[PDB]
Design a binder for this molecule. Structure first.
Ligand SMILES: COC1=C(OC)C(=O)C(C/C=C(/C)CC/C=C(/C)CC/C=C(/C)CC/C=C(\C)CC/C=C(\C)CC/C=C(\C)CC/C=C(/C)CC/C=C(/C)CC/C=C(/C)CCC=C(C)C)=C(C)C1=O
Ligand SMILES: CCCCCCCCCCCCCCCCC[C@@H](O)O[C@H](CO[C@H](O)CCCCCCCCCCCCCCC)COP(=O)(O)OCC[N+](C)(C)C
Ligand SMILES: NC(=O)C1=CN([C@@H]2O[C@H](COP(=O)(O)OP(=O)(O)OC[C@H]3O[C@@H](n4cnc5c(N)ncnc54)[C@H](OP(=O)(O)O)[C@@H]3O)[C@@H](O)[C@H]2O)C=CC1
Ligand SMILES: C=C(C)[C@H]1Cc2c(ccc3c2O[C@@H]2COc4cc(OC)c(OC)cc4[C@@H]2C3=O)O1
Ligand code: SF4
Ligand code: SF4
Ligand code: SF4
Ligand SMILES: [Zn+2]
Lengths: 115, 96, 63, 208, 54, 144, 176, 342, 156
């Protein structure tokens, strides 16, 4: 029950379907994104980044949340295709100017008080 | 009352001065350090104590509306003087 | 139309918050204590949620 | 009471109350509440499913003729189960009147788009999507309007920090503007101003 | 300005002379006046059209 | 008539101290008007007025050629005007400091300073508070 | 109550038609515009000879900030922190402690002039007329750091501009 | 640690890293990257400059408010060096010119200046000194550049025993002379190579790798008296290297052999330029000389740095040298060149 | 030395030419653009100093950042700054450009244009008066007069 209203999908199957269509679109767009923006990354790098972005939300089990995520991904794809985004906006996905933050206990204890 | 630290840097009225091993002094190389030479504590210490023949005096800092809020100072203690909490002026009754 | 979602509510993936500020943060839900310098009790009516205190340091310039 | 107090107008109050009763009688399916403020403002709290009908009625009925959409925004109240409150402000030039329509939604419930009823709503709805994250169904072109490209999160939400999470600076090594986790030379000083003494007895709540 | 020192600040002479005026000046310039709960939409005819505040 | 305008110009060039003064004022201020000397500044500036000009052009200053330490024959700026002549020049008052001198205080600067940005006398910010937390000083003697 | 701006019809008599034809063929209104520009050419320009001439100002003008003193040389500021609380841009930072003589005085008073909106609220909220906005406006710098004023800089500004600040306050304190 | 010099924050722009660095030669190719990497962590950087302040403008946005201080200095004056190194705990030396000027020879910029810097820093109490020499530095090298480099390295080691000496090899980047030098020879029409470049082996290193190595050596407690060699992960012949450079830039490669005396004559002819010379005899000598192999010296891997191959960063330098026809071509379209590794 | 005199005279001539003809790019962001317009108004008439607006960045010498620089816009400002041929100068006008001003603690505001481009002159105010911006422009002219490029080129 829980008395909820859908956005686009009634269950997990249609949500996974829309996810697959969005992944297809991003996969096809990646080489054009590399060509037009004159990025120094390879097509493999962009496709791996797209795969990682999709995998970051693999734990979602709510069709409404998945529908909203697909809507946001379509928004981002439309932003990229129309070249509304700039090279900085595209390259922000990679964090090349961020020092790697360590994850083990000893380094965190050394650097500062944050966990 | 300006005075210099053992490093040669002037000490501000707040009493701050960079330590000998402090790297921040490098910000003053080929430039200067802004120090105000008119120390308010000394300048208010030079003011004479006013003598008034009443137990309670009123102070507004002078200028009427151009001073500080008007306050009333009690002058019963003959061991000390009545000091305004806004302007720092001192008042006392004719003693001895 | 109703689709009968059976899972617990979770909107973390949609808020845009970095994961570091989701897993490592601890919030406090409490009724704020009355300030002891005053006898008023109007500030002890609603509940407050606030995050844990993190590091604050001194700016090298202007302190 | 004369010089420094705002004068009252009970005639407009009566007119607004009568028209609120009129609208409530005509549309019992959606209207949940009607209120008239002390400063002569009419508010109608309705059900979300009646967003499209009610507005259309208010736009097309001969006795309503609310042909102008002055404003459309959202209010975030985290203490409510339905976190977002959608507000429509309508102006009627024929009768020289103003009305307010209020409805509610949450993060995962879409709201029917009223672009068909009012063409002015389009950008407004985009803003509500951009600033609060409320999805509008059957919107002709829904996307961000005010925020930066690729910006994550909805800033006007209450749990969003004032300074955000990222900041921009130019980097010479990569020769471009990059975004990094936010750092402040001086932290924003939070002030606690609410006096511990109640100011308005007329708004005192029951002690639960 | 409205002759209500709980909304509008008093004159500087009154603030430096009267206790009530000083207290009201302090509270208004530190915390400010409290506004009763409520929502309003006020619109004016600005030179560019209708300018409104909700 | 035009002849009277030429005569006015000839009087203008004559009234600036000759041809050399006329050329100096023309190359220093790009203006050759003659007005009544309101006063002279302690740092060398001269202040003139002419109420027959329209508002804004009725008061002006010829800056000094020698400020505190720098040559101001060509390098001049509006920051070299002392506060009293600053008040008079910007039409904040009608009374010049010569006829309405400001109140004298022992803490007011007796020597005006211009904008010292980009100069070894520029302002460098720093913290005016003292050290907050004092660390423990270990003893200087051995423990064993 | 309203009027029309473009609800005028032209006369269709032969004379008016000839006048409009002459207007079209001989460009009368273009000559009118040329004459207007020529008339403006012979007027006196409104330009002033900066920096030798300055635009008018008022005693209410808000410019560079300054900290004032009493005629005895004692600082007016008592560290009440009203200006810090009323500052819309949070540009004021104040730290205070009892002085050596027990006076309530500041130890830190910073104004971030790159944060300040120059609204003048601080000098309205001050109960002792300690912080004021002076008449100076020509204080542009070459570096960002020079616009972060500490207590020493503001005290120097007050000592430098008191002669004009006192006169400006004297001419306007009755409006406050 | 002199409490004010204790690290604080998250290592961002507004953080405190505890590093006070005097970076001599910060207005050069390596200097801008070093200053950027230092100011990223919230360090205090002191930049001594002898050029126009305009030429230092690009260094301004690299730090927070008050974290970069620009100070005038003179190479032949030791009092100025003292003045700029009084309050620093790290002093980095990047001073060096590829050519000779009428006021400064190779010995002046590679022997006298580094020795004076080291002596003054040792007198002033600077904790760490980083010195930069060349990998191919040799006392009996045919090029006076490397002879001066070796003599200055010995002088720096003598004056500052705990100095960390870093020996990179043919740093390549956006503002390099290495890749741009080969790419600009397209204007003449033919590429002159001694022995057709078949007898030279090069191991270029990325600029970001060198800057990160310098930073890590500053933060490494055991790299005090060590000597490092910064080299790339691959070794190429000069012919194959120039071929790949021209292929990435999509320019027709027309190599021809030029004898040693002819190339020396060309270098001497170009040396009379009062401005920055296009090439010199010493540059010709250094170009056609194989990079040394020093397996006994620590490398970038011992500092936690993984060397960036030229194949992933060549396009970011060589896209500027293309025409409009090939401007948008991807990086993986060039078929990386052959490497002589062991 | 004769050569030192020659290079000093040439440097003076070049500095005079560059400071006498300053062409700011026609570029405004917020409220401060109104005061820039008033500086271009007849009362102040920046054109009498040799200062004219030009739309194309390739024909511009100075960039006057007059207004808030937002996150969405900073790449565009950097792009139009990079397309200015050298020598080029940047004048920061108003609190918003200098350090963020009223919107310093905002999620979408760059806390100072100096994070994106190097700044030569900072003009304080909110907004600075047209007189203040004129003072900043004249200070920039003096700073250009202080430049000596050929001198350091000779001493090299
Ligand atoms: C990145 O650094 C570098 C520079 O800085 C930007 C340079 O300028 C530079 C030298 C610049 C060259 C391109 C100069 C080449 C000279 C011209 C392009 C024309 C040369 C051809 C003839 C002189 C013209 C007539 C043709 C004859 C054969 C007759 C080099 C090599 C360099 O590497
Ligand atoms: C055949 C010729 C071929 C080449 C021709 C090239 C062009 C000819 C050279 C042009 C000469 C004119 C320049 C002189 C103008 C100087 C004006 C003077 O006032 O400037 C002063 C100082 O002048 C400069 O310091 C020096 C300028 C020139 C000095 C040397 C130039 C000598 C000419 C050499 C030409 C050789 C050409 C070589 C190539 C063939 C300071 O003024 P400034 O502060 O700004 O303005 C302040 C405004 N105030 C007063 C209202 C406040
Ligand atoms: N491929 C490479 O880059 C090779 C670099 N080398 C070493 O790396 C260091 C830096 O390299 P790189 O950035 O390419 O060199 P650059 O030519 O780009 O700049 C070096 C710096 O040294 C300064 N400088 C040079 N001579 C003097 C002098 N007589 N007095 C004062 N300052 C001077 C320059 O300042 P100014 O602009 O004012 O003249 C310049 O900023 C150098 O020490 C070099 O020897 C190591 C191997 C590889
Ligand atoms: C060219 C001279 C005569 C004046 C006019 C002018 C400038 C400088 C800049 C601009 C400009 O006009 C255009 C068009 O009108 C506005 C109106 C604006 O706000 C009302 C606004 O704010 C950014 C910007 C602009 C343009 C722009 O920036 O000097
Ligand atoms: S003028 Fe306004 S913004 Fe500036 S310091 Fe005063 S109160 Fe703050
Ligand atoms: S309001 Fe006036 S007295 Fe109070 S802290 Fe500010 S400057 Fe000082
Ligand atoms: S500094 Fe003030 S006037 Fe200028 S753009 Fe910002 S808010 Fe507007
Ligand atoms: Zn008093």
């Amino acid at each position: 029950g829980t008395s909820v209203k859908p956005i686009f999908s009634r269950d997990m199957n249609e949500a996974k379907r829309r996810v697959r269509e969005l992944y297809r679109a991003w996969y096809r767009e990646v080489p054009n994104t590399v060509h037009l923006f004159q990025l120094d990354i390879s097509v493999k790098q962009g496709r791996d980044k797209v795969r990682e972005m999709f995998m970051k939300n693999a734990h979602v089990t709510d069709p409404r949340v998945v529908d909203l995520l697909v809507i946001k991904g379509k928004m981002e794809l439309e932003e990229t295709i129309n070249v509304w985004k700039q090279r900085t906006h595209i390259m922000r996905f990679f964090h090349e100017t961020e020092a790697p933050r360590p994850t083990d206990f000893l380094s965190k204890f050394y650097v500062g008080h944050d966990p | 009352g300006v005075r210099t630290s053992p490093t040669g840097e002037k000490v501000t009225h707040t009493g701050q001065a960079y330590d000998d091993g402090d790297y921040r002094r490098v910000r003053f190389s080929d430039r200067q350090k802004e120090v105000n030479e008119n120390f308010a504590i000394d300048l208010i210490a030079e003011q004479p104590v006013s003598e008034v023949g009443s137990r309670v005096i009123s102070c507004d800092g002078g200028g009427g509306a151009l001073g500080h809020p008007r306050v009333y100072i009690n002058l019963d203690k003959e061991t000390k003087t009545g000091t305004c909490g806004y302007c720092g002026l001192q008042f006392r009754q004719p003693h001895h | 139309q109703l689709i009968a979602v059976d899972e617990k509510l979770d909107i973390t993936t949609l808020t845009g918050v970095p994961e570091e500020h989701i897993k490592t943060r601890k919030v406090r839900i409490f009724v704020p204590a009355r300030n002891n310098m005053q006898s008023g009790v109007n500030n002890t009516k609603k509940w407050k949620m606030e995050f844990d205190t993190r590091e604050r340091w001194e700016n090298p310039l202007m302190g | 009471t004369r010089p420094t107090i705002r004068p009252r107008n009970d005639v407009v109050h009566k007119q607004l109350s009568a028209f609120g009763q009129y609208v409530a009688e005509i549309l019992p399916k959606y209207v949940q509440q009607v209120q008239v403020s002390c400063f002569n403002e009419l508010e109608i709290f309705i059900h979300p499913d009646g967003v499209i009908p009610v507005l259309t009625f208010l736009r097309d009925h001969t006795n309503a003729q609310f042909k102008s959409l002055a404003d459309l925004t959202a209010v975030d109240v985290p203490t409510r189960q339905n976190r977002f409150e959608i507000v429509y402000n309508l102006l009627s030039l024929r009768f020289n009147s103003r009305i307010r329509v209020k409805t509610y939604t949450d993060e995962l419930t879409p709201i029917e788009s009223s672009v068909t009823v009012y063409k002015a709503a389009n950008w407004y709805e985009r803003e509500i999507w951009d600033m609060f994250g409320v999805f509008f169904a059957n919107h002709p072109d829904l996307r961000r309007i005010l925020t930066d490209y690729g910006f994550e999160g909805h800033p006007f939400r209450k749990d969003f920090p004032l300074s955000g999470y990222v900041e921009l600076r130019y980097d010479d090594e990569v020769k471009r503007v990059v975004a990094e986790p936010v750092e402040l030379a001086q932290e924003f000083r939070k002030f606690d101003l609410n006096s511990p003494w109640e100011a308005f007895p007329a708004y005192r709540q029951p002690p639960e | 300005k409205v002759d209500d020192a709980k909304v509008s600040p008093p004159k500087r002479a009154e603030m430096k002379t009267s206790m009530e005026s000083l207290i009201h000046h302090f509270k208004l310039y530190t915390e400010g006046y409290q506004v009763p709960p409520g929502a309003t939409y006020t619109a004016i005819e600005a030179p560019k059209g209708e300018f409104g505040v909700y | 008539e035009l002849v009277q305008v030429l005569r006015r110009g000839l009087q203008q060039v004559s009234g600036h101290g000759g041809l050399r003064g006329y050329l100096r004022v023309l190359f220093r201020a790009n203006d050759v008007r003659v007005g009544t000397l309101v006063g002279e500044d302690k740092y060398g500036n001269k202040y003139y007025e002419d109420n027959k000009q329209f508002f804004g052009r009725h008061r002006w200053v010829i800056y000094t050629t020698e400020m505190n330490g720098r040559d101001t024959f060509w390098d001049v700026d509006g920051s070299m005007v002392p506060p009293e002549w600053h008040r008079w020049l910007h039409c904040m008052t009608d009374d010049p400091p010569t006829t309405k001198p400001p109140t004298a205080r022992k803490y007011i600067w007796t020597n005006h300073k211009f904008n010292v940005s980009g100069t070894p006398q520029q302002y460098v910010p720093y913290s005016t508070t003292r050290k907050k937390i004092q660390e423990w000083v270990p003893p200087s003697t051995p423990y064993k | 109550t309203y009027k029309f701006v473009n609800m005028r019809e032209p006369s269709m008599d032969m004379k008016s038609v000839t006048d409009r034809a002459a207007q079209t063929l001989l460009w009368t209104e273009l000559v009118r515009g040329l004459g207007m520009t020529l008339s403006y050419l012979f007027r006196e320009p409104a330009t002033i000879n900066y920096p030798f001439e300055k635009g008018p100002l008022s005693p209410r003008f808000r410019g560079e900030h300054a900290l004032r003193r009493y005629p005895s040389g004692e600082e007016r500021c008592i560290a009440c922190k009203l200006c810090e609380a009323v500052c819309p841009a949070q540009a004021i930072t104040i730290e205070a402690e009892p002085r050596a003589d027990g006076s309530r005085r500041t130890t830190r008073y910073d104004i971030d002039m790159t944060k300040c909106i120059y609204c003048g609220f601080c000098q309205e909220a001050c109960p002792v007329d300690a912080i004021v906005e002076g008449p100076n406006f020509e204080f542009s710098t070459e570096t960002h750091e020079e616009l972060l004023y500490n207590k020493e800089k503001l005290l120097n500004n007050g000592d430098k501009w008191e002669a004009e600040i006192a006169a400006n306050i004297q001419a306007d304190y009755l409006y406050r | 640690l002199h409490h004010a010099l204790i690290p604080h924050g998250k290592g961002g722009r507004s953080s405190v890293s505890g590093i006070v660095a005097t970076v001599f030669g910060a207005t050069g190719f390596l200097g801008r990257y070093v200053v950027n990497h230092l100011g990223r962590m919230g360090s205090q950087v002191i930049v001594p400059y002898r050029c126009e302040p305009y030429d230092t403008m690009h260094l301004r946005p690299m730090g927070d408010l008050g974290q970069i201080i620009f100070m005038e200095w003179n190479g032949k004056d030791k009092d100025s060096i003292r003045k700029v190194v009084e309050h620093s705990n790290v002093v980095i030396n990047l001073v060096g010119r590829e050519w000779e000027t009428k006021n400064f020879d190779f010995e002046d910029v590679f022997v006298k200046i580094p020795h004076a810097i080291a002596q003054v820093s040792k007198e002033a109490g600077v904790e760490k000194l980083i010195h930069i020499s060349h990998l191919n530095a040799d006392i009996k090298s045919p090029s006076r550049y490397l002879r001066s480099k070796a003599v200055g390295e010995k002088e720096v080691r003598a004056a500052f025993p705990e100095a960390t000496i870093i020996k990179p090899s043919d740093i390549f980047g956006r503002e390099d002379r290495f890749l741009n030098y080969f790419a600009s020879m397209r204007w003449f029409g033919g590429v002159p190579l001694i022995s057709l470049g078949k007898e030279t082996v090069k191991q270029p290193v990325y600029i970001v790798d060198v800057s990160k190595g310098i930073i890590n050596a500053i933060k490494d407690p055991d790299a005090k008296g060590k000597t490092f060699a910064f080299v790339g992960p691959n070794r190429y012949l000069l012919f194959d290297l120039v071929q790949y450079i021209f292929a990435v830039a999509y320019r027709p490669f027309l190599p021809y052999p030029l004898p040693h005396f002819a190339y020396r004559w060309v270098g001497r002819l170009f040396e009379v330029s009062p401005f920055e010379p296009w090439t010199t005899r010493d540059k010709v000598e250094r170009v056609h000389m194989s990079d040394m192999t020093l397996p006994h010296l620590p490398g970038l891997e011992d500092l936690g740095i993984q060397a960036t191959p030229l194949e992933l960063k060549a396009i970011e330098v060589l896209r500027r040298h293309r025409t409009y026809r090939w401007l948008t071509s991807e990086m993986e379209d060039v078929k990386p060149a052959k490497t002589v590794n062991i | 030395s004769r050569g030192e005199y020659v290079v000093a005279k040439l440097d003076d001539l070049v500095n005079w030419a560059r400071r006498s003809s300053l062409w700011p790019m026609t570029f405004g962001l917020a409220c401060c653009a109104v005061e820039m317009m008033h500086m271009a108004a007849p009362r102040y008439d920046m054109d009498r100093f040799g200062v004219v607006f030009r739309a194309s960045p390739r024909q511009s010498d100075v960039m006057i950042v007059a207004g808030t620089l937002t996150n969405k816009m900073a790449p565009a400002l950097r792009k139009v700054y990079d397309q200015m041929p050298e020598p080029r100068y940047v004048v920061s006008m108003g609190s918003c450009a200098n350090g963020g001003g009223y919107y310093h603690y905002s999620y979408s505001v760059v806390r100072g244009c100096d994070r994106i481009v190097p700044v030569d002159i900072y003009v304080p105010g909110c907004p600075p008066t047209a007189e203040a911006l004129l003072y900043g422009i004249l200070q920039l002219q003096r700073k250009i007069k202080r430049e000596k490029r050929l001198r350091i080129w000779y001493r090299r």
